[PDB]
Structures are given as C-alpha cells and as structure tokens.
Amino acid sequence: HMVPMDKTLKEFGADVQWDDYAQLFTLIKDGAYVKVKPGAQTAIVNGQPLALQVPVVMKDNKAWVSDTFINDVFQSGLDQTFQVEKRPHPLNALTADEIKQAVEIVKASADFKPNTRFTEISLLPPDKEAVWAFALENKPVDQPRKADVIMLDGKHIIEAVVDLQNNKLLSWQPIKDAHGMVLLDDFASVQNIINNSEEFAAAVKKRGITDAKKVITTPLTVGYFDGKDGLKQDARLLKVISYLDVGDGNYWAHPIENLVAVVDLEQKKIVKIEEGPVVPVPMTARPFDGRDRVAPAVKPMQIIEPEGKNYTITGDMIHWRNWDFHLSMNSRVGPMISTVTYNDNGTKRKVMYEGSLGGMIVPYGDPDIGWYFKAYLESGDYGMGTLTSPIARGKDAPSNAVLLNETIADYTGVPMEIPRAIAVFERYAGPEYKHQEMGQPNVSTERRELVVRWISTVGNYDYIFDWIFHENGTIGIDAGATGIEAVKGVKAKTMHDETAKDDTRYGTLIDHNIVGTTHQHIYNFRLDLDVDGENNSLVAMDPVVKPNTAGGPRTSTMQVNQYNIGNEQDAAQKFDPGTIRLLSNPNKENRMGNPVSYQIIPYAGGTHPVAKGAQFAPDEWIYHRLSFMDKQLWVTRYHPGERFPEGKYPNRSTHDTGLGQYSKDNESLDNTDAVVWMTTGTTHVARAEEWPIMPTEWVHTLLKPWNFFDETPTLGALKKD
Amino acid sequence: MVPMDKTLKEFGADVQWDDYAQLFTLIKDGAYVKVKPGAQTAIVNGQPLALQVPVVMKDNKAWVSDTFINDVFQSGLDQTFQVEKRPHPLNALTADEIKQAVEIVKASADFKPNTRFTEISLLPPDKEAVWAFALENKPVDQPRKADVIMLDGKHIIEAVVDLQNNKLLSWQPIKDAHGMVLLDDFASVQNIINNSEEFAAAVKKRGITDAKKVITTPLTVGYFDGKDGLKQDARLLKVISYLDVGDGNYWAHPIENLVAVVDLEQKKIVKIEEGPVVPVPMTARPFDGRDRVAPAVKPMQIIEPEGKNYTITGDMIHWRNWDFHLSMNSRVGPMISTVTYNDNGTKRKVMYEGSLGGMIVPYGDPDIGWYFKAYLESGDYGMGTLTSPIARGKDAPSNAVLLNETIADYTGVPMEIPRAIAVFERYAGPEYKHQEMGQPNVSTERRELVVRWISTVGNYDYIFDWIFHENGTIGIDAGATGIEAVKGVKAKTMHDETAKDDTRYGTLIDHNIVGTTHQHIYNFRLDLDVDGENNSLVAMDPVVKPNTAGGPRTSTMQVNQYNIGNEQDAAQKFDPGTIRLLSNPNKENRMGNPVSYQIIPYAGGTHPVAKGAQFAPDEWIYHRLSFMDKQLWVTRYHPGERFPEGKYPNRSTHDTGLGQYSKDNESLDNTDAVVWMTTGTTHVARAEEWPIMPTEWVHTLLKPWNFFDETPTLGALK
Ligand SMILES: [Ca+2]
Ligand SMILES: [Ca+2]
Ligand SMILES: [Ca+2]
Ligand SMILES: [Ca+2]
Ligand SMILES: [Cu+2]
Ligand SMILES: [Cu+2]
C-alpha cells in the first residue's frame, strides 16, 4: 500500500516541485536536494543515485509513494549534512533523559515540595580548561556531568546541583530575597484572577467594555521603586495591562488605557487597581495576518545547493571551512556558541570559548500609570530560550537553510523539543575581495558567510539574532526587532485634534487613537573571546590628528594613540566608532611582530536611531539597578558564575548584581582571561509605517581579526614550499 | 547545426546538463530555459516554445540549429526587457549622438587640432518637464542637447550643442580651470619618465638595475599655495613609482622617497624630489592566485525560473511599487532618476535624481611621496569611464541581470562598457514577523532590488549598491576593496630599530611595507522630492526630560522637534541617535503628520568611521573640500550644482563644491531641496588586507516616515 506524495511530503516539511515538461519532481528538505522521475527505479540525493524498489507512481495526475519513501530517501545516508557524534562533547546540553533524571533527584530530596516549579535546569559548566583540552587535544573530561536546578517553591528560589553520573544530590540552597522569573502558568493565573475579580469587571465596564470575557490581559514585571509605587518588596507581583479582543486577531490594537491591576501571585488575587481617566478603546479592526488583503503575485526565487552543504553537523558540533564550533541551547538566553576555533593551515587556533546573548532590556519612556514601570528584562524575566519561535521555512530563513530542533526543560521539569529552533545557512555576501587592474584579467572571489539564526518572541515583540561567521575570520552578531507595537490609547484621531499635543508627548500618533510609545531595545552580548589563547589584554588605538613636525607643506598628520586598558573599571566605557578597541594576546605575534588580536566593534550600524545609553535621568532606579545599559563596551575577568548583564535574579532587584557588580572590584585585565560584553541598542520613535505590524529593524556588531593572520585570510593554499 | 556548448558559451549563457533527467538548463540574465534532446518544445521562463529544429545529441555533444539562440532567447518569452517606444528625456547620449556632438564642435573654427574630451553628456530638459513626462506622459518639447567639455592642451572649453538642429549653441573658454586626468596622460607620464636620464639616474641610486621595469602612477598634486614649489598655471602630475618583479603586483614594490613632477604640456619632468634611500621590497606578493589552490566547494545557485519581477524598458526599471530611470555618466557613474512609489495605484514622487556626488581619499603621512595625496576619484579620474565590468556570479549574485552602458571616450568615440551595472533582487530576511503565542505564525519575506556598480581607480576598487526595499526604504551602500597604496620602510618586524618611526603614520602590514593611514570619504547627491517639490528640513532630537506628570518617574523620553531653515544650519554633523527628516509641509498622512523621508547618512560600516576630516582646519585639502567634515548637507535645487568637490577640483584653490553652494545660506523653507550625504571611513590597515583587501562596507538609508498610513507591504485591501 502507498500514500499520496504531496500531502505526506508537505506534512514531513519538505518542499515539493513538479516540472511537467521534464516530468521531474524536485524535493527539498534541509541538506537534502532530491530529484525523482515517476516510474524511475532510481532517485538522486545530493548528486548521488539511490535505488528504489518502489518507484514514485503517477496516477490520474496524483503522485503516490511507498510508505517508506520518506525514510528511504531522506535518511539514506547520501545527505551527509548530519553525522553521528562518536565521543560526546562535554558542552552538549542536557538530554531529555538527563532532564528527567535531574528532576527525579530533586523530587526524592527530603526538602522538595509538590508545587515546586523549575525556572531553569541546565548543564552545570564543566571547567573551561578541560573543555578546551577536549576540543583541541581530545582529552576526556574526567568530571561528572552535573546540572543546575533552579526551583521556585511558591515565590522562593532554591538552587540545587545534581550529579548525573552518580545520580545524587550535591547541594540544595535557598536564595533569600531573590524573586523568580515569570513562568507560563503565571499567565493563565493572571487571566483567571482578572476574570474572577468583581471589581475589575466593574472597572472595565465603566470604560465602555460590555463583555468582560473579551478582555485579554498581559503579565508585566513591576520593577523596583524603593516603595514609591506602593508595592511590598517581598511579595510576588505582576502588573496587568489589558486589551479588548475584537476578533481581528490583534488585541494589541485595542488598549484599555489607564487601567492597571496589580496581582499578587501567591495570594492569587488582585491586591491593587490603579485607574486613570477613561479613554475610549480604539475598536477599528487592524489585523496584520493578511485576512483582509489581496495576495500579490510574485515569481519564485530559490537558493539551492544541489550537491548538499559545505558544513557538516556532528552532534552539536558544526564544522565549516576553517571554522569549528559547538552550538547548544539554554532556556534563558537561547543559543550558546562554544569552543570556536579557526583552522590556520593545520593548526586550530582558539578564537572564542563561549558566546551568547547576555541579556537585554526594553525601557519605556512615558510616565503614566500604564507605563512608568515598563522596563522589560526579556531573557531574564521571561526566558527567551523557552519562548523561541519555530522558524517558518523560507520566510524567517532563506530556502537553503537547515533547521535544527533543540531540547530544553519546561517549567514543570518535562523535556520540551522546540521544532526549528535555530536555522543554519550559508549565504553569498558580495565579493570577498576584487582588483580589476587595468588592461589585465580581473581578480574577484565571492564572500561566503555561515549564519546561525534564532528567533524569540516575548509577548508582542519578536527578536532575531544572527551569529555570522565570515569565511575570512570575521564574526558578526546582529539583532533584528519586529512584531507588534505596545500602544497607548488616546483621544486624538489626527495631529489636528485638541489633545494631539499631549497625547504625543511620549510617542508618535501612528493610527487614530493610537500612539506608539517611545522606548528602547538595548541588547547585551557576553563574549568570552580567547584570542589565540586564554591570556589577553585590552588595547586602545585612537586615531588622532597631530601637528606635523616633519617638514613639508602639511600642518597635520594622522597618527594613533595606542595604550593598554589595565582594569575592569576603565574597560567599562562608551564606544566611539571612530576608534579601535582590541582584545590582543601579548604572548603571540603575527609574522610582522604584532600581537595577534581581535577588534571589538559594539556599534557597526543600525536601521533605527541608536541608543547612546539608556534614556533615563541618572536619578531613576532602573538606571541604578542596572548599569549595563549605559556603556557599550565592558571587559571583565573570567568567572564561571558571571553571565548576565542584568544580574541573575533581576525581577524586582534592588541593586545591581550584574556588570556593575562583576567589575565593582576593578580587577586587572593585564595578560589574563578576559570576557567581553558588548551593548548596543535602538531608540524607537514610531511611525505609521510600523502599524499594524513592524518591519524588521536591525543593529550590527562586529569582531574582526587584527594582525591575527599574516596575510589576506582567504587567499588560498600556497602551491609552493 | 552548431555545437551547443560552444555557441552558448560564446553567447554568454550558462549551460547545465542533468543526466538523470536528460535535461539541459540554460541561463542568461532574465532567461531561464529548459530543453530536452529530441523534444519538439522547450520552456522559457515557465512558458512552452515550439522549436523548428529539436536539439540533437551527436557523439554525446549537443547540436542546435544556427537560429537557436535567436529563436529561444529573443523569442519574446523572456519579458525582462521591453521595447521603449517613447524614450525617456533623461536617456543618456547614444553612440550616434556622441559622434554627432563631436562633429558639431569639430566643424567650428575654434576647434584646435588635438583637442580631447573630458566629458560629453546630456544637457537634460528642465526638471519640471522631466517629471511631467514621467508622471503624465507629457512630451518634453525641447531638442536633445549635449554638454561637451573640451581640453585643448591644458585649456578647458565648455560647449553646448543642439543635436536635433545640428548646431553649436555655445563655446566658452573656462579661465583658470585645470582639466581632469585623461587616459593618454598615463602613457605620456610613463614615456616622459622612460626618457629621463635624470630619473633613470635617481632610480639607479635606489637599487633598481633595469629602469624598464619601473612602473609609474600619475597623481593629481593638489594645491598648497605655492608651498610645494609648483606653478599654478602649468598642467602637472606627480609620479610615484614601483618596481615590476613579475608577481603581477607592482603595488607591492614601492620605490620610496622618490617623486617626479611632470609638466604635461612641456612633456618633461620639471622637478624631482628625493629622500632617504629605502631598498625596494622585493618578495613576490601576487593576489591573482597564480601561487594558490582554492579549496573545493559544493555549488550554490540563486534562480528565478519564471523570470524576474522587474522589467527594463529602455532604461526605465519597474519593480513592485517602484519605478525609476537608470542612466550612466562618465564622471560619476550611475544616475537614478524620476523615482516614484506606486501607493495603491497612485505614483508618488520620492527622488528626482540621485547619484554619487563625488568622493576623496586623502592620506595622513607628511613625507615627500605622500603629503599631497588626496585623490578626487570621480572628479580627477572619471569613475564612470573607469567602470569595471561585473564578473558574473562573483561581483554580483548568480540571479542578477548585467547591463551594458555607453559613454564617450576621451577622443570622443563611443565606448560600450560591458556588464557595467548589475541589477538583482535578493532575499533579505523576514520583512516583518509576529508569532503570537498559541496562534498561527505571521511572517513575510523582505525583498530588496539592488543596482550595483563597480569603478576601479588605479589600485582601489569601489562598489556602489543603490538598494530599493519593497517597503519604500532606499539604502545606498559603498564597498571598498583592491590593493593598498603602501610605503616602503626598512623594518621587517615591529622588533626592528626603525619600526616605531616606520609606523607613525600607518601599520606594518608586511616586511618593509606599511599601509599608510588614509580615509575614504564618499558623498551622495540626492535630489529627493518628498511627495512633491516643496519640502522642509525638520530635526527631531530624542531627549530625556523631567517628568511633570506625577508618579515615581523622575524623567521621560520626549522629542525636541524644530525646523532647520537655512543652508548654513543644514550643513551639519550627524548624530545617529537623532532623526533628520525631509518633510513635505503641504501634504500629510491619515494621522495628520507631514509626509516625510528620514535621512540617515550614517547607518553603519565595517571599518572605523570618519568622524570628520582627519585634517587640521588649516590644511589646504580641508579648505578646498568643506564636504568632508559634515555628514549632512541640504541646498536649494540648482541644475549646475552637482559635485560636492566642485566642477574643476584639480589644483583647486578654494571650495567650488558644497562650500560655494551653501555659501549664500539661502532658505530651505517649503522649497526644492537637495540632500547630500557624506559618509566615510578612517582606514588603519592590517595584515589581513595584504596583498589584497577584503571588501569593507559603509551603509546609508532613506526611510519613509509617515509617508504612508500603515505597513506598506500588507497589500491592497480586498
Ligand atoms: Ca571582576
Ligand atoms: Ca577569554
Ligand atoms: Ca528636491
Ligand atoms: Ca544655494
Ligand atoms: Cu521597538
Ligand atoms: Cu582604504
């Protein structure tokens, strides 16, 4: 018995193309590029013949395949994109089994309690030195695989460490005063609490809402204001902003302004309701899904790699032209790029031990009741890894991409497989270099970049991160921002209405009765670069115009002030794109005697206005609790437990436990293991072109080899000597 | 019959044979053809075509009729190019018009025997008539005219000819102007050096044993108010030399501290400057792969099997909601004109004309062979003339369409540049996306149309991309690659004695070779007409203000908005944290906001950014080119103000570019404005850029700002 080709292949996730003239089917799926003619006894997979006992059968124009076609073809082995790992990499994320194992260990402990939730279950970082000897020398890690289990017992956080090898509990430590991040059940809880509240229902009714069941709530962190917001620091609270569901698939376009409920999650009740002036709910339908639009006509455009990919994925290790790296997922920060090396003519040179998103913040600038406290710690308070958005094949990533699946732990301790969690794709990026000497044959080569892309959606905002490995040693890190804007309901319909001026003091009027409140997206990346080795120093090279003292007609010259940045405190700074900042290896030089280095560029450009620091007066608390928002470059001594720019438990934090703390002691950065942190962001002043849905806006950052090599890096293998 | 491979390859089409399907896939620019041996039909961009003569398979080689190419590629099924029955008024001079304009000036009694042509281009009808032709099909009713700038010896003459009526309209000698460098000046300089005993002598002293291996490079010398000892009236060129060692890269063998000054009318060296003798770096440093072997790679193709989404009618390009005209100029290259955005059936004005305005590459070493180095690339060398033909699949992606363009050479003879510009659509990530939790995802792909042009000037190769986004945004990026201009030095490593002094003005990129620090400063002249001719420049500076509304916050995020009323105020530094708009005060979108375009001179770059001119305000190059120290400029529209550096920048003594255009500080309120964006790089070299430099890019953007009433790509409402 057989099945219908088209339906089965689409279900499977493969692209199916029929060519009536050639009587040929082209099937595409990740690294597999297949050709199959109806009735043929053979098929082609990445340029290679594959025998078929059961040929594709074309009936009354319907094609049918055998029930094993999918596996016989796609898992044949002719697609060599994915290979089996022999010796398990020490940085491999916890498997579904280990996740279950770690949860059983803790649930067997005498102190564990039944409603306990899990904010994070991740592999406990094996020691850096052993992981590199494994990557570079293949030495086995002789330490037991362990896992960090962060639990939320009601509102109390407990940190445990389980030994997975020996299956035992190593520690159980309650962490006083820390608040846990927001977990998925919190969302349903806030909704129900709102729905059962008689007073809220009454507040909504006096705002024109008739059917209280149509109210959509959203749970937001409240921050910390030393009590001026009149909130008890010890309670587990969330503020609640609501919208009216009108059926256009976008409740975000119908804000109920000036109504804020404060919910205490352990008490399961609304403990406070702030109300302001009544503003009619914008009711116009504003769908962004295309339901009310005409589908244009566009001709097909496909990027194809008919013989397979240039990279190979073994376990979680990716090898691609001279680069080698390990890629894993973390429920809080998303992807982690590790043990990154560059093969230089046979020798693998270290470039970066571990790289990932650090954290990010989205601070709003309106003082009203529904906005003064909005300053979202996306990853820290919401868990971006858990909120990963599955890639939509050919739209969110190019058609020649390979989509990876990743597994992490959900809040109850159960393994969760996120489909299409990360896209990996090679891409043409113009000429690598070119020289057309006049009268001579031209010289040009193409530039290839290997992109690792991951998307996370937090409520209304969708963030995209691309880790870009250029064949020449360069590494780019870009962040894209799209989604739906958080808007303010207002009475003005046009800038000509009486309240226009005041309605738009904190934002642009992007639709009738709707204002896109100004805010910023500030991202921070934690990059543990190891420039050709562990011991590095921070070097400054500032281009300057100095008076000429060499004679001849010129009055000035272009020279450079070169100096080392010796400690953490002076390494914490603003970045002038006119200058050069390097992470050099004072122990190793290139062929010309210069220290092998990487130039750090926290600001390479963007399509939205740039944030030059957080837009807050120095006396605001969000400005105090968090220091990472004001400097674009930070450099700290390596430490296994310093990974978040906003600190480990930022929800209602009262003091900086992040980059402000990691550099507070101002340690020496001279010839030592350094860790680089880049902060870049946008200042978002809205426009009508961004509603109902926002076009993707991007920010770029770069890491370039500076005298790390001796010559143009992609010139090619030397034919002589 | 004729061999298929041979004929197709001669034609420039790519041929792929698939043995499994017994199918040939042939591709050329917008044609994507499929044909099986023996089939009575073929497919061209998804449509069936009857063949007179089937493809025949001989001794495993395919043969086709001798009319195959014509029948298949020119059958009409490839709709990329359409006939232009009514020529746009900005269409460049054709080869017949160039020849004709040349005859008209040659027929005048003032034409002198060996006159050369620095530029012969179209003298366009007025702006208004051109927009009425584009928007209402109204015929311009003026004769086709051309500007013919002549160089008689060293004297510049500007004439104007009427092509229809075949008559000379004007002949005006231009006093004090120095002409641009012409091709023949290249061979005169080498020849003059070759015959100079004094020069051969200096070269001998420097180690060179065979003076026939010396490669000259002619450079403009600027102006130093006489401090360089050069006569202002003489047509001069300075000459830097290199030794050819057979590695195909003379640039890697500088003959440091040797400069000859050649007087092109006298045809002789009029001064020789000599400094410390530095042995010429000799090690072979080829960049063409003669000494290399590339690693094998799996193939990648970008195909559009049903053809392109864009159409090219004459020079008019149509794509999506965009419409624009593309023409070529010998001096600045490509010109994008009559750009409009079709908003739900109505064409709205965006830009009347946009192009590179001018660029400069000034150096920062004070020494004898470098102090005067400040090349006006397009102005002194002619970037359009120097266009570098696109290497298909490499300088541009495999799904591009390459265009040929024609201009006049220095002797007035038409010259056709093959693959002078590439046009190509590309995938650029998700246009927008929203994955609401628990609901079906929403994502659309972003498509951009790029217009790419490459110009090579001596050792440096410049790439320009004019990028039209489907959503109305327009990007302009500039890439720099090529070979660096290096200084010979004695140090081999930073451990040698002179290393410190040898690197004061540049990095030691190779043994005995320093990449002298310099800047790359580009300027784009963009006559934007935001929804109409009359616009105003409005600033919007995001600022932190005290909260006066109550609640716990001490501050708020607000905007300081105010008009920039005059040219002087419009000439300014650009803070990427602020917003600058070119608004149409007479038109507004649905919410009542003035329709505008946000101008961003600085959207990023891969090399350090030029904060301004790395020159003290009293340097001559600083005074001659005010455009280099301000990233944004806005002037009132004037047909003869087109170059940021001025019309005749060779040995200029004062600013005749943007400095002169804004001089009068006129009003920019509600009038025809022209925006100029200056963007650049400060280039401190590295070993990774030798012997050949990895392309570095700079990015600029023009974004619709309340020009529309909602997301421009949602589509028309059902
Ligand atoms: Ca520290
Ligand atoms: Ca490090
Ligand atoms: Ca204008
Ligand atoms: Ca003016
Ligand atoms: Cu935003
Ligand atoms: Cu340069």
From Swiss-Prot, chain A:
Record-listed Ca(2+) 1 binding positions: D528, L529, D530, D673, A674
Residues annotated for Cu cation binding in this entry: H519, H521, H684
Binding locations of Mn(2+): D528, D530, D673
Keywords carried by this UniProt record: Calcium, Copper, Manganese, Metal-binding, Oxidoreductase, Periplasm, Signal, TPQ
Compartments where located: Periplasm
Notes on how activity is controlled: Inhibited by 2-hydrazinopyridine.
Listed pathway(s): Amino-acid degradation; L-phenylalanine degradation; phenylacetate from L-phenylalanine: step 2/3
Stretches the record annotates as Disordered: 645-666
Major localization class: periplasm
Source taxon at top rank: Bacteria
Any one GO BP annotation for this protein: amine metabolic process
Modification comment: Topaquinone (TPQ) is generated by copper-dependent autoxidation of a specific tyrosyl residue.
Gene Ontology terms: cellular component: periplasmic space
Modification type 2',4',5'-topaquinone: residues: Y461
Catalytic activity entry: a primary methyl amine + O2 + H2O = an aldehyde + H2O2 + NH4(+); 2-phenylethylamine + O2 + H2O = 2-phenylacetaldehyde + H2O2 + NH4(+)
Active site: E378 (proton acceptor), Y461 (schiff-base intermediate with substrate)
Enzyme class name: oxidoreductase
A GO molecular function held by the record: quinone binding
Oxidoreductase in keyword set: yes
Iron as UniProt keyword: no
Cofactor details (free text): Binds 1 copper ion per subunit. Can also use zinc ion as cofactor.
Transmembrane segments: none
PANTHER family the record matches: AMINE OXIDASE (PTHR10638:SF41), COPPER AMINE OXIDASE (PTHR10638)
Protein name: Primary amine oxidase
UniProtKB/Swiss-Prot annotation, chain B:
Binding annotation for Cu cation: H518, H520, H683
Binding site for Ca(2+) 2: E567, Y661, D664, E666, A673
Record PTM text: Topaquinone (TPQ) is generated by copper-dependent autoxidation of a specific tyrosyl residue.
PROSITE patterns: COPPER_AMINE_OXID_1, COPPER_AMINE_OXID_2
Pathway linked to the protein: Amino-acid degradation; L-phenylalanine degradation; phenylacetate from L-phenylalanine: step 2/3
Modification 2',4',5'-topaquinone occurs at: Y460
One CC-aspect GO term: periplasmic space
Alphabetical UniProt keywords: Calcium, Copper, Manganese, Metal-binding, Oxidoreductase, Periplasm, Signal, TPQ
Top-level class of the enzyme under EC nomenclature: oxidoreductase
Free-text cofactor note: Binds 1 copper ion per subunit. Can also use zinc ion as cofactor. Binds 2 calcium ions per subunit.
Binding site for Ca(2+) 1: D527, L528, D529, D672, A673
Keyword GTP-binding listed: no
Region described as Disordered: spans on this chain: 644-665
Binding-site residues for substrate, renumbered to this chain: 375-386, 457-462
Transmembrane segments: none
Manganese as UniProt keyword: yes
One of the protein's GO biological processes: L-phenylalanine catabolic process
One GO molecular-function entry: quinone binding
Primary location recorded for the protein, binned into one broad class: periplasm
InterPro entries, A to Z: Cu_Am_Ox_Cu-bd, Cu_Am_ox_TPQ-bd, Cu_amine_oxidase, Cu_amine_oxidase-like_N, Cu_amine_oxidase_C, Cu_amine_oxidase_C_sf, Cu_amine_oxidase_N-reg, Cu_amine_oxidase_N2
PANTHER family linked: AMINE OXIDASE, COPPER AMINE OXIDASE
Physiological role: The enzyme prefers aromatic over aliphatic amines.
Family the entry assigns: Belongs to the copper/topaquinone oxidase family.
Protein name from the UniProt record: Primary amine oxidase
Lineage, top ranks: Bacteria, Pseudomonadati, Pseudomonadota, Gammaproteobacteria, Enterobacterales
